[PDB]
Structures are given as C-alpha cells and as structure tokens.
Amino acid sequence: QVNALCEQLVKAVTVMMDPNSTQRYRLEALKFCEEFKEKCPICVPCGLRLAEKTQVAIVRHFGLQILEHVVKFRWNGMSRLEKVYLKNSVMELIANGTLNILEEENHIKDALSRIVVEMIKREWPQHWPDMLIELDTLSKQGETQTELVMFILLRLAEDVVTFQTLPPQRRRDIQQTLTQNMERIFSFLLNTLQENVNKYQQVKTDTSQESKAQANCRVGVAALNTLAGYIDWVSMSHITAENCKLLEILCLLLNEQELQLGAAECLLIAVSRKGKLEDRKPLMVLFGDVAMHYILSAAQTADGGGLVEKHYVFLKRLCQVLCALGNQLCALLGADSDVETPSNFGKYLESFLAFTTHPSQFLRSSTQMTWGALFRHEILSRDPLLLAIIPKYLRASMTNLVKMGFPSKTDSPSCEYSRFDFDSDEDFNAFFNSSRAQQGEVMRLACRLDPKTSFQMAGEWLKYQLSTFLDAGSLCSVFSPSFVQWEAMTLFLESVITQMFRTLNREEIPVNDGIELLQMVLNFDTKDPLILSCVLTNVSALFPFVTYRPEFLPQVFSKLFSSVTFETVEESKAPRTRAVRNVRRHACSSIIKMCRDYPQLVLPNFDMLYNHVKQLLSNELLLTQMEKCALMEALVLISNQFKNYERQKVFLEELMAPVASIWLSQDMHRVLSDVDAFIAYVGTDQKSCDPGLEDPCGLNRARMSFCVYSILGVVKRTCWPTDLEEAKAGGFVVGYTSSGNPIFRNPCTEQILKLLDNLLALIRTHNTLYAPEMLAKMAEPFTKALDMLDAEKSAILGLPQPLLELNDSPVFKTVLERMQRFFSTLYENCFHILGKAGPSMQQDFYTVEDLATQLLSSAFVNLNNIPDYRLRPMLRVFVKPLVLFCPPEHYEALVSPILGPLFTYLHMRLSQKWQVINQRESQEMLEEQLVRMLTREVMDLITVCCVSELTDLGKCLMKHEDVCTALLITAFNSLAWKDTLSCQRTTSQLCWPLLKQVLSGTLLADAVTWLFTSVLKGLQMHGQHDGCMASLVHLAFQIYEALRPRYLEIRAVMEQIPEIQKDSLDQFDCKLLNPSLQKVADKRRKDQFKRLIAGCIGKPLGEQFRKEVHIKNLPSLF
C-alpha cells in the first residue's frame, strides 16, 4: 500500500529527471510530486523509505527532500510522537543509513544536513537538552558521522547567523544557546580536527590503505570549513582560549598540501577580525619564530611550485595573512602599553618585501596597503629596521612602476600570473593604472621617511632616461620599454619631488642637484610626442627649483609654449594624432599650473606672455579652442596677481572683446535663438556626407565652442585678493552685508553679464533640441549626435576603456564622435558657466533682473526629454554649486522658486524609472546604472541642501510648503530603492532632521501613514546590509517614540509585521507608552524591539553561494 505508492513516486522521478520525457508527462509528474509533498499525510514514511542506501541516490535525494519539506511546513500539523520518531529515525540515518564516506554523493549529505539543521532550527533551544552530547557521541562512532556533523554545524551556523531562514525569536534563542555553549562547540570542533588530523598523520603513507588517507583527509577538510564557518563570527575569546593553540594547529597544517588551503583560510579569517583591540593582542604570537617558520616554509614552498591553480591560490592566501597581520600590528601599537614591536620584525619585513618583489601583479598590489600602514604609523616609522628596508623598498617600487606584464605578451615573467588573474589586456591595464595610483600615495609615505635616497634614485633614473636609448616599437610606440620606463620614471620623480618639497625644510633641499636636473630636462629634445609629454611633466615637477634660480624662467617658458605648437610632426598632410593633442594639452595645462602656483614669478613678464598669446591667437586656424582658452585662463591667473580692480577689469575687457564681437553679433544672436538656424550653423542637416564641404560648419561650431570656453575660463579663473586689506586697497570691496561681512566685486562681471542672455538662449535651444520633434530634424548620419558617448558608456558600465596606441591613432576617427563630443562638452560647459557664475560674481549674479524665472525658462525648458546622462552633470555642475554658494538673504529670492519644481520633477522621474526597474546585456544595464547614479546625485543634492543639527538654509527651505511636500516623500521613498549606498546616506544624516523641524506641522500633516510604510518597505528592500540595518532601525526607533504617544494608527502596520506575538508587543509597547524614566531608565531600548520587527529585516540569497555570503572576513582573490 505504501511500497506501491513509493514505486509510483520512483516512476515520477525516473520520468521527471529524464531528457527523453515529453513536457506533458513531465509536467504531470511534477504536479504529482509537489502535490505529494503538499497534499499527502503519509509523505513521512514514504520519504524515509525512499532514502534507503539500497535505492538509487536520485530517488534518495528525492526522499530526504520530501522529508525536508515536512519539517519545513507540515511540522505545524504534527504530533509529539511523530516528531520524536522523526528525530530518532533521522539520527538512525546519520549513524547507519548513509553510503560509504568515500563514494557517497555530496548533495545527499547536503540534503540530509538540511533536514537535521531544520530540525535544529525548529526545537533545539528547548526541546533538545542533550543535542551537543548526542552529536559528539554519534560522531565518535565513525568518520562519515564526523563529516556529516561538520556539515550540520556549518549549515546551522550559516542559517542562524547570516541567512536567518528561521523564526526570529527562535533565532535569538538559538544564537544565545550557541553563545552560552560556544566554548564546548569550538572545543569539540578543535579536538575533532586535531584527532582526525593526527590519525591522518599516522596513516599518511600505506601500501594499500589509501581509503583511510582520503577519508580522514576529507574529514579534516570538512572540519576546517566548519571552523572557518565559526571563526568569522564567534567571540575572540574562544580563538585565544587554550593559549591560542588553534593558531599553532593551523600553522602545523600549513605544511600539509592536502589541507593547507583550509588552515590558511581559517588563519586569515582569524587575523582579519576588526574586533576589540585588547582581544586582538595574542594574534601577535604569529610574529614568533615558530609561526613565521611554518608560514614562510609553506609560503616559499608554494612559490616553488609552478603556476598551478592550487599553489598560486594558497600563496595569495598566505600573502593576505601577512598583510592582515601587519595591519593588526599597526592597529595595536600606540593604543596599549602591553603591545610592543615584535622581536622578528626584521624577518617579517624581509619576507613582505619578498612578496613586494614577486612577479605576480596581484601579490605586489596586495602588500601596498600594509606598507602604507607601516610608513604612516607614528611608532613604526621610527623603527630602524623599516628605515633600513626603505631603500630596497623604493628600488623594488621603481621596478614595479613600469607597465609590463600584459597577459597577451610574454616579455615579462609577470605575464603568466597576469594570464592567471586577468581576462584581457584591458583589465590588466586598468588594474595596473589604479594600483599604480595607490603605490604613488604609499610611495610618497615612504619618501617622507628617507628623502635623500629617494631624490638620489629619482635623479639617477631621470639621467638614465635622458642618456639611455631604449627600444621604441614610425619611431613611435606605446608598449615599448622606452615609453613605459619614461612614464614610470616621470611618476616616480613627480612623487619624490612633491613629497620632498612637502616635508623637507628649505634649508635641506638639494638646490644644486635639482637645478642640474631641470637644466638637463630643459636641454633635452625629442620629436616623439609621448616622450615630450614626459619631459613637460618632469619640468612641472622640477619647477619648484626655479624659485631658487629664476634665471631659468625664460627657458622654461620656451619649453612650455613651444610644446603648445607641437604640430612639427604633420601640418596638413594627415590629421594630428591623439598623442599630439595630449602634448599640446599638457603644455597649456603646465602653463596654467605655473601661472597658478607661482604668479609672482610670471607677473613681471605679463606683457611678453600676453603678447605671445595674442600672437598665437592672431591666426584663428592655428590653435585649438581648448588651447586658446587655456592660455587665456593662464593670462587671467597672472592678472589676478595685479590685485587692482581697474587693471584686471581693463585687461579682461580687452581680452574678451574678440569673444564679445562673435557672441553679441545679431547673426550669432539669431543662431542661438532659432532652433532651425542653430542646426544650419552647426551643420547637422547634411543628407549626403562627403569629407569635403564640412569645413565651414567646423569653423562655425569651433567659433561657438571658442566663445563658450572663453566665458567659462574667465568666470572660473578670475578672483579678488584673498587678504581683505589688499581687497580694499585694489578697490574690490564696495560695501558690507547686513551681518557685517564684506562685499566683493569681480572685474569680469560687467563683461560676462552682457553674455549671460545669449548663453541662456543657447541653453534654451540645446535643451529644446533633445525633444523628439526637434531631434528628428537632424540628418540621418547625425541622428546620434545627442547620444551618450561610447567612452562614457564603457566608463559607467565598469568595463575597461579600449586599449590603443596614442602615437598612431586619429583624434576622432568618426565625424559622428566629433559631433557627440562637441554637443556633450558644449552642454556641460554651459552649465559649468552657470555653475561657477554664482561664486565668481555672487551678488551681481544673484541680483540679476528676473534671475530665477530666466533660469526656469532657459535651463529647465524640456526636462522630460533630457536623458539621465545629461541630467546628472547638470545637477552636479550647476544646481549644487548654485545652492551651496548662495547667501541666506538671496535664498528665497531665486533658490526656493527653482528648487521646488526641480525637486518635484526629480521625485516623479526617479519614482517612475525606479518603478520600471523594480517591476522586473549592455544596453539595458546602461540605463539602469544611469538611473542609479542619477538617484545618488539627487540624494546628495537634497542632503547637502538641508543638512550640514539642521543647517540654516535647510530651515529656510522648510519654511516653504512645496519644498516640504516634495522633500518629505522623496527622502523617505528613497529607502525602497535598490541603491544601498544612497539609503544609508539619507537615513542617519538626512531623514531624521526632516522630522525635528516639522513637529508643529506633523500633527496637521498626519504623515504617520506614509512614513512608517516607507521606512518599513525600505527595510524590506535592502535589509541584508548591516549599515542600512543599524541606521534604518535607528530611524525606526526614532519614529517609534515620536509618533506612538500621538497616534494609534502605528499598530495597524506594526502588527502586520510577520512573526509577532501580541503578548510580546503589548508587553513592550504599553510599558514604553508610559515614560517611567524616574522609575526605570534605559538607553538601549533599540535592541529590545528589534525582535518586534523582523519580517522587514531582509535575508540574503543563500541557495547558490552559501559560504561566500556567510564569511565576511575573507578578502576576494580578485
């Protein structure tokens, strides 16, 4: 009667998991299986019958699965005798009903472990008085039983600590029972691991008894994985209980290749705990001769093996162990007197340096953080051993700055490890660039400790590159030793000199040697653009020496300005390569940096610099617009040093007059007004495309770009003297505020205000051009002229940038990309002008006649059709600086009338697109990521607009009604969105001040209904993140004691939270309703009602990647 039903089930399985079965028989079989679990009361003895070892494992995997199902749901409708019969029968399965440990399927053990762990979840807190003793006794009987016990303990700890697939009150009961008996649990795990490991040691080698070797080995693996499952979260006292004997056992396991990875992971998890400082002291035991003996022996033994998938991972693990150990030593010294410098610090530094010189790029990048923590420490940066290893570290660092080791090539021994750790040359390029940017900071931290040797090696390297001839891939290259060694030397010298002038006294600076190097790089000459860029960066790096010997100032000029006109490669026979543009750009940039950081040196030469610049501007076709306006920015930076209002005023009028004639001409005025004439001027209406006849339009859009760039530069660079006395003397102070603050006037104001109107017209036409009605007016080859650039797409999508040789590569290679870049840089540059316009000319720009209405009629014309990738730079570049740089007197004049409808539209749009996303390769995730970053920028803008404990401007906003009815729903509706980093930002900093200033209106608003659902749904959204849990509960506690003594409608949703006892709630609510603070005082009532809200706590996905989500102290191997 049951054996026939079990045969029917076996038929359902053999037709279910069969590729030959048609879908109809298959779907009906599935229905019979799920309906067997759901509809049958005799599923327990059937499932127990199917799990017999004699049956096929598949059927068994079904049977226990069925059984599992029972203890999940059908348990509720069960009797006591059925329960105890199920426990006894399942334990009989663990003791006897299991296949041989060597050949038993692992997933069978996993399902059985699911059963036992679920039965533990159900009744272990009270109904299992001797479960630990029982698991111990049954484990002692055999090896299979010990392994299964390891599975049960690991999965149990995973579910109770991380996944929380268990009633919450039972979760606290089980967690407290674990914490109480944790000494016995960890003692059992350690004793069993040591026992099975010792038996493995005694049976390491036998003639024909390998079954016990592989068996006890696998048992040791399971025990190590369970220990790794507990070490991550248990208290530190159990790790160091028996005088840290766990650490010595794990170190003894490092020599065993079959168990080394597990021991290394357990040790790494142990030393990576950022817990209580006094409990982390005994970790320093690992600096001893014994622990470092096993660690170093197993480490350099693993390196002796080739690039095998095992030895490399183990080597990474040990490297991370040494890193986290060093971070521990850095984190302990200085805070406690009992912590001292280890006796074997020198050998540790030598081995760590050996990891720094390793071919693997990953291993080299892993040590950089610990090195920075060593150099940054106050005590260890004075230890003579570290200072003794600093020269070797700097030499190895210089060796590491050269970009070599691409996985596609085979020129370096790093290429092999790069093939192991990376997918393509692009990944290796981006990773190497970032890690190099980090070793710049760590390397400077090393240079401040030994300036003499660092400057010595930098100078020697510079002389080497100036004298030595190296292979260069046309005599030009980007991957050759020439370019990579030139770049590495340039960055090294840059960091060395920068930190030198940052730390060294002026009395101890090698002026003669630095001046010598500056002369050597000024005399050096190359026709290669990239090398020329390296030379320019070396001149800008060596420039501080000019202050001691300003005689070099002419020649330096000659080196920079000549580089501005580096068209010597090709004039008109072929287009200029991207390398050339990069060189001229480096030249103009270096000129700006010189005029910005040393204005008093260039000021007496303002006449010759102005004359040479205007001689470069005499020919319109010679210089690029960015180059022209960059040199203009330099001239303005020099002009600021005049410190006289009328002088800088006259110079700016004369400088901007050519921009005034082109910008204020009625032809240009009509171009920026009519949307059709704008297209005819830019030239996007071209039906048939030919390389010729496109030049006049290029001069048109080039002239417009020149005007916009010039306005942006003059607004950005012009400034009045910092010192108030020099401001009054030069005529820059024209009044005083109501509060008594000074009033300043900018010389560029009178000129820029004449351009503001046409600028706003251009912004109007550009914002309108995104409408599909006007977008369809463009030609077919220019339908994507307003689309997002490919570099922006690959950048926001996280994918690496394309890898190309700058020496042989056109600047655009596509007229469509030239158009797209033009529209992007123009659209962003205009909002840069309006962004910097406020702080540049504050009162004269804020008192503009009908300012807010003109901005709403120019900058916010078509916000529906404007995409996200154009909206976010607008808010970050224009709105945020405009709000943050506006006084509270002019606050309600133009800030609020713009912020109201803008924030409203942001709430509506973000709500819509976020609904589209949450309702469910590179094209869709692109838009999704755009929405996410747009949400981040909106939340940051709203945050700084209202929070610095609420700021003054925030309250001045809270006076208004529209910004409140649009501000309150946004910050609290933002919690229900997937962006986790933006949730923690608004909760602790923004969401709470939004209530302390509406206490008088909260009674009239009755917003208790929307607020509690918003915060609860927001907890349901992320949940898993500990930060969002702590902050979201902090808000949940703040909104609990604030609205409960006012409304009774809180209990309408407070009781809708699942797994809630009315006795518990009413015994933690009514006692909280009455203050009784004079009777009972409590400060930590948060941890009391956290159990009252757990259906919203959220749980991470825990069916696919079980171990990685649970263990949070294991660094990713990357």
Side-chain angles (χ1 to χ4, degrees):
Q1 68 292 338
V2 53
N3 196 86
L5 179 59
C6 291
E7 273 195 349
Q8 201 165 3
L9 292 182
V10 171
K11 295 180 180 181
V13 189
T14 193
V15 307
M16 176 178 63
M17 301 176 178
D18 187 14
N20 306 331
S21 303
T22 58
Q23 296 194 0
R24 303 196 171 187
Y25 285 69
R26 182 175 60 99
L27 67 89
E28 188 175 0
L30 301 160
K31 258 194 173 185
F32 196 86
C33 296
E34 296 179 352
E35 280 175 4
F36 176 82
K37 306 177 183 179
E38 170 189 350
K39 302 285 186 175
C40 182
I42 316 292
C43 49
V44 183
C46 293
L48 182 59
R49 173 80 165 92
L50 298 169
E52 290 184 346
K53 313 178 300 297
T54 61
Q55 295 293 335
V56 187
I58 297 177
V59 177
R60 299 169 58 197
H61 180 64
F62 184 52
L64 290 184
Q65 185 170 348
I66 296 180
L67 200 47
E68 182 192 297
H69 187 121
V70 181
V71 76
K72 293 206 170 187
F73 324 98
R74 195 182 166 275
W75 179 282
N76 292 333
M78 279 184 57
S79 58
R80 287 293 302 177
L81 300 187
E82 285 183 335
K83 292 170 178 183
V84 298
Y85 173 74
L86 187 45
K87 313 164 205 309
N88 297 14
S89 60
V90 167
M91 298 303 179
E92 286 179 10
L93 299 179
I94 303 181
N96 306 323
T98 48
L99 264 184
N100 314 336
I101 179 179
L102 194 147
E103 291 191 2
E104 187 166 28
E105 288 280 13
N106 45 15
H107 64 91
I108 305 290
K109 318 172 186 178
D110 222 340
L112 204 161
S113 301
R114 292 185 200 179
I115 296 184
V116 184
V117 166
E118 285 288 342
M119 299 197 308
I120 291 176
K121 298 177 194 175
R122 188 72 61 173
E123 68 156 37
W124 181 55
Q126 57 280 334
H127 298 349
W128 281 95
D130 52 355
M131 189 214 64
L132 303 172
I133 311 177
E134 178 174 339
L135 297 184
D136 191 3
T137 52
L138 71 90
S139 68
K140 297 174 183 176
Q141 294 178 339
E143 300 175 346
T144 323
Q145 294 82 334
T146 46
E147 187 197 19
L148 297 185
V149 162
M150 300 305 174
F151 278 83
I152 296 165
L153 297 178
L154 177 58
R155 175 170 294 261
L156 165 64
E158 287 165 348
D159 292 10
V160 67
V161 175
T162 302
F163 307 115
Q164 299 189 337
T165 59
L166 161 71
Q169 300 180 159
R170 291 178 181 172
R171 199 211 78 263
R172 296 194 59 85
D173 298 359
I174 292 180
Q175 215 166 26
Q176 288 188 7
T177 311
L178 290 172
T179 310
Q180 166 70 9
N181 301 335
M182 193 55 237
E183 195 274 341
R184 309 182 183 184
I185 296 172
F186 181 84
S187 298
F188 167 80
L189 295 169
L190 190 60
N191 291 138
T192 43
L193 171 71
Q194 188 178 8
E195 183 175 350
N196 298 270
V197 152
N198 288 337
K199 301 311 171 184
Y200 183 35
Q201 293 174 353
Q202 291 293 337
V203 200
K204 268 178 185 182
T205 52
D206 263 334
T207 56
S208 302
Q209 204 178 12
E210 295 83 46
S211 61
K212 296 222 60 178
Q214 302 176 359
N216 292 120
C217 169
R218 202 131 54 185
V219 171
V221 175
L224 278 179
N225 291 24
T226 306
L227 274 181
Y230 283 92
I231 290 172
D232 171 66
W233 68 278
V234 299
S235 180
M236 209 99 62
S237 58
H238 304 102
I239 305 175
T240 75
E242 208 75 14
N243 194 80
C244 310
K245 210 170 190 303
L246 160 75
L247 304 181
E248 216 62 52
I249 295 176
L250 294 173
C251 290
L252 284 170
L253 293 180
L254 292 173
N255 287 11
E256 206 63 27
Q257 177 173 327
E258 228 67 26
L259 312 177
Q260 55 181 3
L261 183 57
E265 291 184 0
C266 293
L267 182 61
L268 178 56
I269 294 169
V271 306
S272 300
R273 184 83 72 81
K274 197 69 176 60
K276 211 66 176 61
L277 268 66
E278 63 177 5
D279 295 330
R280 296 156 61 185
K281 287 189 178 66
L283 295 176
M284 302 295 98
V285 160
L286 294 178
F287 276 105
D289 291 311
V290 187
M292 197 60 58
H293 164 66
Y294 295 124
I295 290 177
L296 289 186
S297 62
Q300 301 298 326
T301 302
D303 190 20
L307 191 55
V308 192
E309 211 274 341
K310 336 161 187 176
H311 301 108
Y312 192 23
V313 169
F314 180 62
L315 192 57
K316 296 178 179 180
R317 285 276 101 101
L318 284 182
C319 179
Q320 298 169 334
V321 171
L322 295 177
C323 292
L325 185 60
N327 285 97
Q328 281 281 160
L329 175 61
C330 297
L332 290 182
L333 258 179
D336 296 327
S337 177
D338 208 3
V339 177
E340 298 175 350
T341 296
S343 306
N344 295 278
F345 194 58
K347 294 207 62 179
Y348 168 77
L349 261 56
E350 185 179 9
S351 306
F352 211 63
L353 185 67
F355 276 85
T356 309
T357 67
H358 196 271
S360 172
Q361 189 72 36
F362 175 77
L363 293 182
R364 299 203 296 248
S365 300
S366 296
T367 61
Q368 299 175 356
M369 283 296 303
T370 313
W371 278 118
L374 289 170
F375 304 143
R376 198 184 302 102
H377 201 7
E378 286 179 286
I379 291 181
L380 293 179
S381 63
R382 302 188 187 95
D383 191 294
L385 299 164
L386 189 142
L387 278 66
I389 210 176
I390 283 179
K392 303 168 62 181
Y393 165 82
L394 284 167
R395 199 166 289 102
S397 188
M398 297 186 317
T399 312
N400 298 340
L401 260 61
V402 180
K403 182 180 294 178
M404 286 192 304
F406 291 94
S408 63
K409 295 176 176 55
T410 174
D411 49 358
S412 173
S414 182
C415 301
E416 209 183 8
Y417 297 84
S418 299
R419 282 189 294 271
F420 194 100
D421 292 331
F422 300 89
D423 297 327
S424 62
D425 291 12
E426 289 77 6
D427 293 321
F428 174 79
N429 193 33
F431 176 83
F432 187 90
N433 293 333
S434 62
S435 182
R436 186 166 60 175
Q438 191 175 18
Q439 199 188 188
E441 179 188 17
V442 177
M443 185 175 55
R444 282 177 285 268
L445 295 187
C447 286
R448 71 160 307 108
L449 267 51
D450 196 337
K452 271 71 180 179
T453 65
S454 62
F455 185 84
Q456 162 76 9
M457 306 169 89
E460 291 296 329
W461 201 354
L462 174 62
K463 300 178 179 181
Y464 183 89
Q465 295 301 138
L466 293 180
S467 62
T468 308
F469 173 83
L470 310 95
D471 183 19
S474 57
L475 45 94
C476 306
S477 58
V478 182
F479 287 172
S480 63
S482 177
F483 176 71
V484 295
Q485 290 186 43
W486 264 97
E487 193 181 33
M489 182 276 305
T490 310
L491 299 170
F492 182 68
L493 179 135
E494 191 186 39
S495 301
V496 166
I497 296 179
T498 303
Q499 191 73 294
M500 177 178 64
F501 279 89
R502 276 183 182 176
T503 73
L504 267 187
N505 301 327
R506 306 169 182 174
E507 58 194 352
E508 214 168 353
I509 291 182
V511 181
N512 288 21
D513 301 330
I515 285 297
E516 192 185 80
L517 296 175
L518 173 64
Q519 187 70 80
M520 294 187 62
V521 303
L522 284 176
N523 304 340
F524 182 79
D525 182 21
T526 39
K527 307 297 182 177
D528 195 320
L530 302 182
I531 310 298
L532 209 170
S533 287
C534 283
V535 172
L536 293 181
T537 308
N538 288 281
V539 174
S540 281
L542 289 154
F543 198 91
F545 294 105
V546 180
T547 60
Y548 298 134
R549 297 275 310 281
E551 310 87 88
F552 287 74
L553 200 54
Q555 181 70 12
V556 167
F557 290 175
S558 182
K559 170 120 293 185
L560 299 187
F561 280 83
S562 298
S563 306
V564 181
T565 61
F566 186 65
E567 207 190 15
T568 65
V569 48
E570 268 163 357
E571 39 176 351
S572 297
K573 185 184 304 301
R576 291 203 266 97
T577 67
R578 272 171 66 170
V580 178
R581 208 236 321 121
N582 296 8
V583 175
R584 317 154 64 86
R585 187 168 66 179
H586 282 98
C588 302
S589 172
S590 302
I591 297 178
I592 293 185
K593 176 184 180 180
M594 172 184 58
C595 301
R596 178 193 65 184
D597 301 351
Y598 309 88
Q600 75 284 27
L601 272 68
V602 307
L603 178 59
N605 319 280
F606 176 81
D607 288 327
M608 69 144 301
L609 290 175
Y610 187 20
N611 287 16
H612 185 255
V613 166
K614 67 171 58 182
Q615 282 192 27
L616 294 177
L617 307 183
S618 62
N619 181 273
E620 185 187 13
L621 315 176
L622 171 58
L623 285 186
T624 317
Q625 276 53 42
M626 303 184 303
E627 303 171 357
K628 302 181 174 181
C629 299
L631 298 183
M632 288 180 172
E633 291 186 35
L635 288 185
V636 175
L637 282 175
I638 309 177
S639 71
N640 294 335
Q641 206 60 27
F642 285 126
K643 296 171 183 173
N644 177 267
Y645 175 82
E646 296 298 327
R647 186 90 158 275
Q648 310 181 36
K649 164 73 169 303
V650 171
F651 162 69
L652 288 184
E653 300 280 327
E654 178 184 341
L655 177 65
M656 289 293 288
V659 186
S661 294
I662 301 183
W663 190 249
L664 297 183
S665 61
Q666 60 175 352
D667 190 8
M668 177 65 60
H669 180 85
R670 292 177 180 180
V671 163
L672 307 179
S673 306
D674 194 7
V675 191
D676 295 2
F678 174 82
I679 279 181
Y681 191 72
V682 175
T684 63
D685 49 355
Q686 180 53 57
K687 314 173 186 178
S688 299
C689 52
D690 290 325
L693 299 175
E694 311 188 81
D695 298 331
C697 301
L699 270 69
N700 294 329
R701 54 184 175 265
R703 285 178 176 176
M704 177 185 304
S705 185
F706 165 74
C707 294
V708 172
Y709 263 120
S710 294
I711 303 175
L712 178 53
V714 174
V715 171
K716 177 168 55 183
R717 296 305 187 178
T718 314
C719 71
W720 57 81
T722 301
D723 176 61
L724 285 78
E725 307 298 327
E726 297 177 351
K728 314 170 192 176
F732 297 90
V733 184
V734 82
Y736 289 94
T737 72
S738 303
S739 302
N741 298 328
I743 290 286
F744 298 109
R745 56 173 183 173
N746 195 303
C748 76
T749 300
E750 191 168 344
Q751 188 62 36
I752 302 299
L753 294 190
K754 300 184 178 181
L755 324 173
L756 174 59
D757 48 354
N758 290 264
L759 178 70
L760 293 177
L762 176 58
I763 301 175
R764 248 204 305 264
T765 306
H766 201 84
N767 287 241
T768 296
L769 206 48
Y770 282 87
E773 301 83 4
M774 319 304 296
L775 181 140
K777 192 170 300 184
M778 297 180 177
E780 209 288 328
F782 298 139
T783 180
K784 310 174 185 178
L786 267 51
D787 286 358
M788 187 178 181
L789 277 165
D790 294 335
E792 302 162 344
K793 293 181 178 181
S794 62
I796 189 183
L797 224 54
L799 298 181
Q801 290 283 347
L803 185 53
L804 50 89
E805 300 246 358
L806 305 173
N807 265 321
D808 183 14
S809 179
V811 53
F812 297 116
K813 204 167 192 61
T814 297
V815 65
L816 173 61
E817 188 181 13
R818 188 191 303 173
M819 283 299 186
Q820 295 170 345
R821 165 145 285 99
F822 171 77
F823 285 103
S824 293
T825 193
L826 175 58
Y827 169 85
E828 187 157 334
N829 276 343
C830 291
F831 285 87
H832 259 288
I833 301 180
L834 287 192
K836 301 282 188 177
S840 184
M841 40 186 189
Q842 304 162 321
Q843 295 80 6
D844 292 353
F845 182 68
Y846 290 152
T847 59
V848 169
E849 296 278 317
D850 299 0
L851 192 273
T853 55
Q854 272 181 322
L855 288 186
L856 292 174
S857 66
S858 297
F860 311 89
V861 179
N862 185 348
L863 292 189
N864 292 323
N865 301 129
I866 277 180
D868 307 331
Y869 64 87
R870 295 303 169 96
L871 179 62
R872 196 185 75 261
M874 163 180 182
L875 302 180
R876 178 251 300 178
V877 164
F878 162 71
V879 178
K880 191 176 182 180
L882 180 142
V883 177
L884 286 183
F885 281 87
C886 187
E889 38 270 39
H890 308 81
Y891 201 71
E892 63 279 55
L894 61 98
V895 176
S896 306
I898 297 178
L899 280 191
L902 181 60
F903 286 152
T904 298
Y905 175 77
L906 295 182
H907 181 70
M908 290 184 56
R909 184 173 184 173
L910 265 60
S911 297
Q912 172 182 335
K913 283 182 168 61
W914 267 110
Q915 170 265 353
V916 177
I917 296 181
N918 60 46
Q919 195 154 338
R920 168 57 60 181
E921 166 60 31
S922 295
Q923 299 178 357
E924 180 177 352
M925 196 183 305
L926 174 68
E927 296 178 347
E928 175 174 343
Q929 192 70 17
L930 286 168
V931 177
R932 179 171 303 183
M933 291 187 57
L934 176 59
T935 302
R936 263 165 180 171
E937 188 62 33
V938 170
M939 289 295 99
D940 186 17
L941 173 65
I942 280 181
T943 299
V944 302
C945 282
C946 304
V947 180
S948 59
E949 48 189 352
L950 205 152
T951 179
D952 309 332
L953 306 180
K955 301 198 305 176
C956 188
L957 279 179
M958 301 305 290
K959 144 75 188 172
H960 304 72
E961 293 185 354
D962 290 326
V963 312
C964 285
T965 184
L967 178 68
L968 227 57
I969 55 183
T970 311
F972 291 89
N973 207 346
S974 303
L975 312 179
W977 294 337
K978 192 60 180 182
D979 193 5
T980 307
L981 270 303
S982 68
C983 182
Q984 184 183 355
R985 199 75 184 188
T986 67
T987 46
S988 60
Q989 301 174 348
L990 174 68
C991 287
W992 175 239
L994 262 55
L995 301 184
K996 285 291 300 302
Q997 298 290 346
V998 298
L999 297 177
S1000 61
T1002 306
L1003 307 178
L1004 184 64
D1006 196 7
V1008 61
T1009 303
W1010 200 282
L1011 174 140
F1012 204 60
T1013 57
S1014 64
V1015 181
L1016 261 57
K1017 192 181 302 299
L1019 268 161
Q1020 298 173 351
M1021 189 52 177
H1022 315 101
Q1024 51 185 347
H1025 195 266
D1026 297 1
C1028 288
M1029 177 184 304
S1031 193
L1032 269 172
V1033 164
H1034 180 93
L1035 289 192
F1037 179 83
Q1038 285 179 326
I1039 68 182
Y1040 184 83
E1041 296 184 349
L1043 317 172
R1044 194 65 180 184
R1046 296 185 174 186
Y1047 307 95
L1048 291 180
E1049 301 188 16
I1050 292 189
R1051 211 177 73 107
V1053 195
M1054 259 294 298
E1055 291 184 327
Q1056 284 180 332
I1057 299 174
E1059 301 89 26
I1060 281 188
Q1061 306 179 191
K1062 290 188 176 183
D1063 293 325
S1064 62
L1065 174 59
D1066 296 336
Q1067 278 170 352
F1068 286 117
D1069 182 24
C1070 181
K1071 305 178 185 177
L1072 253 170
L1073 182 61
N1074 182 269
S1076 297
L1077 191 61
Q1078 297 177 345
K1079 298 180 178 180
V1080 184
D1082 197 336
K1083 293 184 178 182
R1084 294 185 178 181
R1085 292 174 177 174
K1086 297 173 181 169
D1087 300 334
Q1088 187 170 277
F1089 87 109
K1090 284 181 180 180
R1091 184 175 51 87
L1092 293 182
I1093 166 176
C1096 310
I1097 284 189
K1099 57 176 184 179
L1101 299 178
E1103 82 159 45
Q1104 195 170 14
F1105 296 152
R1106 194 86 162 187
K1107 183 182 179 181
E1108 296 184 354
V1109 185
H1110 171 62
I1111 294 181
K1112 302 174 184 177
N1113 287 330
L1114 260 188
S1116 299
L1117 289 174
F1118 194 88

